[PDB]
Amino acid sequence: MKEIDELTIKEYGVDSRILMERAGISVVLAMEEELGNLSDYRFLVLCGGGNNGGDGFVVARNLLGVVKDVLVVFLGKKKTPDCEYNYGLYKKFGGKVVEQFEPSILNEFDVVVDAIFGTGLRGEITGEYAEIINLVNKSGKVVVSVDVPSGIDSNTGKVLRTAVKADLTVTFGVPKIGHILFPGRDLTGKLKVANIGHPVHLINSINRYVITREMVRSLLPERPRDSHKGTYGKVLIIAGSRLYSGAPVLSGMGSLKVGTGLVKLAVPFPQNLIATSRFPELISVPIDTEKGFFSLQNLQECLELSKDVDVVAIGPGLGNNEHVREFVNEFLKTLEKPAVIDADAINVLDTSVLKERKSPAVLTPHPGEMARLVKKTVGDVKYNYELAEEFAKENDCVLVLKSATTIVTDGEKTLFNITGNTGLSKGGSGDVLTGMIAGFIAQGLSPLEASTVSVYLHGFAAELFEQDERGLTASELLRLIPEAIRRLK
Amino acid sequence: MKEIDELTIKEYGVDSRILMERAGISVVLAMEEELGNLSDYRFLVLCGGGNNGGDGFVVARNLLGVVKDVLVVFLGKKKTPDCEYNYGLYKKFGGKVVEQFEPSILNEFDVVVDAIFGTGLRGEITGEYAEIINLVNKSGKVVVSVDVPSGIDSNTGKVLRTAVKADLTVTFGVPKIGHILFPGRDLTGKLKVANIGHPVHLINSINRYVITREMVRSLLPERPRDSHKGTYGKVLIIAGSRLYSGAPVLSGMGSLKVGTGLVKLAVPFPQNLIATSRFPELISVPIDTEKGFFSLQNLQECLELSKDVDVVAIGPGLGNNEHVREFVNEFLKTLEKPAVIDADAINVLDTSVLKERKSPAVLTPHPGEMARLVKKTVGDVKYNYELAEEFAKENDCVLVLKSATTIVTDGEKTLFNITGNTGLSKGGSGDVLTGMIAGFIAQGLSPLEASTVSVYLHGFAAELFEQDERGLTASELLRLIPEAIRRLK
Amino acid sequence: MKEIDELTIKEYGVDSRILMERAGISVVLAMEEELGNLSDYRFLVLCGGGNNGGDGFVVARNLLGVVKDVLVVFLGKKKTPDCEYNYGLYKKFGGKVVEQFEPSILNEFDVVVDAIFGTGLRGEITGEYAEIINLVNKSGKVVVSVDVPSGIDSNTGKVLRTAVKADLTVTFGVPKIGHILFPGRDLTGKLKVANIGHPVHLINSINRYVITREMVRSLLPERPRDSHKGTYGKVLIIAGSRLYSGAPVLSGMGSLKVGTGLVKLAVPFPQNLIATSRFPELISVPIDTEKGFFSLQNLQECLELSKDVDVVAIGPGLGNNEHVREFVNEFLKTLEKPAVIDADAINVLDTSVLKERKSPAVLTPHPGEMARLVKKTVGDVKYNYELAEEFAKENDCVLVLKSATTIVTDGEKTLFNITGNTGLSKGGSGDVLTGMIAGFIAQGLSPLEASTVSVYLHGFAAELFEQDERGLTASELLRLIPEAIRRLK
Ligand SMILES: CC(C)(COP(=O)(O)OP(=O)(O)OC[C@H]1O[C@@H](n2cnc3c(N)ncnc32)[C@H](O)[C@@H]1OP(=O)(O)O)[C@@H](O)C(=O)NCCC(=O)NCCS
Ligand SMILES: CC(C)(COP(=O)(O)OP(=O)(O)OC[C@H]1O[C@@H](n2cnc3c(N)ncnc32)[C@H](O)[C@@H]1OP(=O)(O)O)[C@@H](O)C(=O)NCCC(=O)NCCS
Ligand SMILES: CC(C)(COP(=O)(O)OP(=O)(O)OC[C@H]1O[C@@H](n2cnc3c(N)ncnc32)[C@H](O)[C@@H]1OP(=O)(O)O)[C@@H](O)C(=O)NCCC(=O)NCCS
Ligand SMILES: CC(C)(COP(=O)(O)OP(=O)(O)OC[C@H]1O[C@@H](n2cnc3c(N)ncnc32)[C@H](O)[C@@H]1OP(=O)(O)O)[C@@H](O)C(=O)NCCC(=O)NCCS
Ligand SMILES: CC(C)(COP(=O)(O)OP(=O)(O)OC[C@H]1O[C@@H](n2cnc3c(N)ncnc32)[C@H](O)[C@@H]1OP(=O)(O)O)[C@@H](O)C(=O)NCCC(=O)NCCS
Ligand SMILES: CC(C)(COP(=O)(O)OP(=O)(O)OC[C@H]1O[C@@H](n2cnc3c(N)ncnc32)[C@H](O)[C@@H]1OP(=O)(O)O)[C@@H](O)C(=O)NCCC(=O)NCCS
Ligand SMILES: [K+]
Ligand SMILES: [K+]
Ligand SMILES: [K+]
Report DSSP letters for A316-327, one per residue.
TT---SHHHHHH
Question: Buried b / exposed e across C454-474, counting CB within 10 Å, b at 16+?
Answer: bbbbbbbbbbbbeeeeeebeb
The helix/strand/coil state of A287 is strand
Task: Give the Cα-Cα-Cα angle C113, C115, C116 (nearest 5 degrees).
Answer: 125
In angstroms, the first-to-last Cα distance of chain B is: 32
Both A229 and A116 in one domain: the answer is no
In three state form, how does the secondary structure of C345-377 look? HHHCCCCHHHHHCCCCEEECCCHHHHHHHHCCC
Nearest-CB residue to B481 (from A277, A421, A471): A471
Find the closest chain B residue to A474 by CA distance: B281
Q: If DSSP codes are grouped into helix, strand and coil, which group holds residue B238? A: strand
Backbone angles phi, psi at C172, to 5 degrees: -120, 125
DSSP 3-state helix, strand, coil percentages of chain B (rounded to 5)? Answer: 45, 15, 40
C188 and C244: one domain? no
CA atoms of B299 and C101, how far apart (whole Å): 75
Inter-residue contact B118 to B146 (CB < 8 Å):
yes
A117 lies in the same domain as A251:
no
> Nearest-CA neighbor of A206 among A176, A232, A178?
A176
- Among C10, C16, C18, the strongest candidate for a mutation testing the B interface, having the largest count of B CBs within 10 A, is C18
User: Using CA atoms, how far apart are residues B294 and B284, in angstroms rounded to an integer?
Assistant: 15
Same structural domain, B195 and B259: no
d(CA B4, CA B198): 7
CB B241 within 8 Å of CB B319: yes
Judgement on whether residues C27 and C158 belong to the same structural domain of the protein: yes
Structural contact between residues A388 and A407, judged by C-beta atoms closer than 8 angstroms: yes
Instruction: Please state the separation of Cα A437 from the chain's center in Å.
Output: 17
Q: Is residue B73 within 8 Å of B102, Cβ to Cβ?
A: no
Domain that holds residue B115: 1-206
* Amino acid symbol at C442: A
Q: How many CB atoms lie within 10 A of CB C6?
A: 11
If you count residue pairs, one on A and one on B, with CB atoms under 8 Å apart, how many are there?
113
For residues A406 and A393, what is the distance between their CA atoms, to the nearest angstrom?
18
| The residue type at B78 | K
Three-class HEC string of B11-60: CCCCCHHHHHHHHHHHHHHHHHHHHCCCCCCEEEEEECCCHHHHHHHHHH
Q: What CA–CA distance (Å, rounded) separates A248 from A241?
A: 9
E runs forming strands in A255-360: 262-268, 283-287, 311-314, 339-341
Cβ atoms C369, C315 nearer than 8 A = no
**CA-based R_g, chain B, Å:** 26
Euclidean distance between CA atoms B17 and C278, whole angstroms: 69
* Cα–Cα dist C50/C63, whole Å: 20
Question: What region, left, alpha or beta, does residue B8 occupy, with left being phi > 0 and alpha being psi -120 to 50 degrees?
Answer: alpha
Distance of alpha carbon B314 from alpha carbon B330, whole angstroms: 13
Q: Is B19 in the pocket of ligand 3 (CB under 6 A)?
A: yes
3-state secondary structure labels for all residues of B438-477 = HHHHHCCCCHHHHHHHHHHHHHHHHHCCCCCHHHCCHHHH
Task: Count the neighbouring beta carbons within 10 Å of the beta carbon of residue B134.
Answer: 14
Instruction: In whole angstroms, give the CA distance from residue B316 to residue B180.
Output: 28
How far is residue A258's CA from residue A219's CA, in Å, rounded to a whole number? 13
Domain boundary among A206, A231, A264: A206
C60: Cα within 13 Å, side-chain hemisphere: 32
Closest CA to C433 of C469, C408, C468: C408
Residues 6+ apart with CB under 8 A from A78: A49
Domain harbouring A347, CATH code: 3.40.1190.20
One domain, residues A484 and A344: yes
**Domain tally for chain A?**
2
Residues in chain A: 489
Amino acid identity of A194?
A
Query: Does the bond joining A199 to the residue before it have cis omega, within 30 degrees of 0?
Result: no
Q: Rounded to whole angstroms, what are the CA distances from A267 to A43, A289, A294?
A: 64, 9, 8
Q: Which protein residues touch ligand 1 with a CB less than 6 Å away?
A: A 2, 5, 16, 19-20, 23, 48-53, 55, 76, 80, 82, 117-125, 129, 147, 172
Chain B nearest CA to C110, separation (Å): 22
Report d(CA A49, CA A80) in Å as an integer. 6
Which backbone phi and psi does B151 adopt, to 5 degrees? 105, -10
Question: Residue A399 forms beta bridges with which residues?
Answer: A363, A409
| Strand partners of residue A283 | A264
For the purposes of burial, counting CB atoms within 10 Å of the CB of B148, is it exposed (0-12), middle (13-18) or buried (19 or more)? Answer: buried
Q: Which residue in B401, B462, B464, B383 sits closest to B428, CA to CA?
A: B462
Contact (CB, 8 A) for B226 and B232: no
Spacing of C-alpha C98 from chain mean position: 40
Domain limit, last residue, from B206, B223, B252:
B206
Shared domain check, C413 and C286: yes
Closest CA in chain B for residue A275: B277
Q: Which residues contact C138 (CB under 8 A, 6 or more apart)?
A: none
Q: Is C93 left (phi over 0), alpha (psi -120 to 50) or beta?
A: alpha
Is C178 found in the same domain as C231? no
Please choose, from the candidates B416, B411, B374, the residue with its C-alpha nearest in 3D space to the C-alpha of residue B392.
Answer: B411
> Does B14 sit within 8 Å of C197, measured CB to CB?
no
The single-letter DSSP state of residue A290 is: S
Q: Are C33 and B30 spatial neighbours (Cβ–Cβ below 8 Å)? A: no
User: What size, in residues, is chain B?
Assistant: 489
Resolution in A: 2.0
3-state secondary structure of A473: coil
What is Dmax (Cα atoms) for chain A?
A: 85
Same domain, C195 and C244: no
Is the CB of residue B81 below 6 angstroms from any atom belonging to ligand 4?
Answer: no
H-helix or E-strand containing B353?
helix B352-356
- Residue A313: which of A392, A375, A258 has the closest Cα? A258
Instruction: State how far Cα C11 lies from the chain centre.
Output: 33
Q: Quick check: C452 and C219 in contact, CB under 8 A? A: yes
Question: For residue C46, what is the domain's CATH number?
Answer: 3.40.50.10260
Instruction: List CB contacts of A102: < 8 A, sequence separation 6 or more.
Output: none
Whether residue B17 and residue C17 make contact (CB cut-off 8 A), yes or no, is yes
User: Hey, how many other C-beta atoms are within 10 angstroms of the C-beta on A66?
Assistant: 11
- CA distances A187 to A162, A173, C167, C457, Å, are 11, 20, 42, 63
With contact defined as beta carbons under 8 Å apart, do B354 and B337 qualify? no
How far the first Cα of chain C sits from its last, in Å, is: 32
Question: How far is Cα A257 from Cα B103, in angstroms, rounded to an integer?
Answer: 72
Residue A348 CA, chain-centre distance (Å), reads 26
How far is the centre of ligand 5, averaged over its atoms, from the C-alpha of C88 (Å)?
Answer: 19
B263–A422 C-beta distance less than 8 A:
no
Please provide the DSSP assignment of A107-124 as one string. GG-SEEEEES--TT--S-
Instruction: Mark yes or no for CB contact A246/B280 under 8 Å.
Output: yes
Q: Considering only CA atoms, which of B117, B121, B112, B210 is closest in space to residue B167?
A: B112
Q: Tell me phi and psi for residue C421, to 5 degrees.
A: -160, -175
SS3 content of chain C, % helix, strand, coil (to 5): 45, 15, 40
Let me know whether B170 and B241 are in one domain: no
Residue B208 φ then ψ, to 5° = -115, 150
Collapsing DSSP to helix, strand or coil, A187 comes out as: helix
Amino acid at B426: K
Pocket test for ligand 6, best of C378, C407, C425 (most atoms within 8 A of CB): C378
Give the start-end residues of each E strand in A173-218.
190-194, 208-210
Alpha helical stretches, state H, C160-308: 177-180, 184-188, 200-203, 213-219, 247-257, 273-278, 299-306
Spatial CB neighbours of C10, under 8 Å, sequence gap ≥ 6: none
Tell me the residue length of chain C.
489
Q: Among A216, A291, A238, which residue's Cα sits nearest to residue A452?
A: A216
Q: Is B459 in the pocket of ligand 3 (CB under 6 A)?
A: no
Of C176, C206, C236, the one marking the end of a domain is C206
> Does B245 sit in the ligand 4 pocket, CB within 6 Å?
no
Neighbours of A206 (CB within 10 A): 13
Rounded to a whole number of angstroms, the distance between the first and last alpha carbons of chain A is 32
C219 lies in the same domain as C118:
no
Claim to verify: residue A212 and residue A162 sit in the same structural domain: no
